[PDB]
Design a protein around this ligand. Sequence first.
Ligand SMILES: NC(=O)c1cccc(Cn2c3c(c4cccc(C(=O)O)c42)CCCCC3)c1
Length: 131
Amino acid sequence: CDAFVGTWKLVSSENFDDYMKEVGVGFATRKVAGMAKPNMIISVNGDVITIKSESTFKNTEISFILGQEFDEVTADDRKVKSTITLDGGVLVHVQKWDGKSTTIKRKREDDKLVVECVMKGVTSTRVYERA
Ligand SMILES: NC(=O)c1cccc(Cn2c3c(c4cccc(C(=O)O)c42)CCCCC3)c1
């Protein structure tokens, strides 16, 4: 996937605190992650895609090949099994841990990168625009 490539700034966000709470993120991390306005800087080299998320709270990064499950350490220190695929132009990320699942989709919409987060019955939408 490549139409996702470049540098994106979070401009809006709904229900993220609720989403985090449902994922199991403790209050202090929720406070600082919720308040953060991370840049998401996505790039691609052959079959390896790299997504960086940068903010004063925390800098993270994942590198991966579509369809190949990998170990991820999240910003909220979960140790999850991750599996990112391309499906009808949406990058679908799945995290499994403790028999739990959450799914994160990134899609390109007009000039936005739209990220939809889902845990159990809680859904969250965040929007990022080019830097
Ligand atoms: N400070 C930062 O770098 C930062 C802040 C908020 C979210 C994120 C990334 N992120 C994270 C989660 C998540 C779910 C859907 C979309 C994003 C995103 O905007 O990339 C998410 C799980 C909760 C723990 C925080 C990491 C990063």
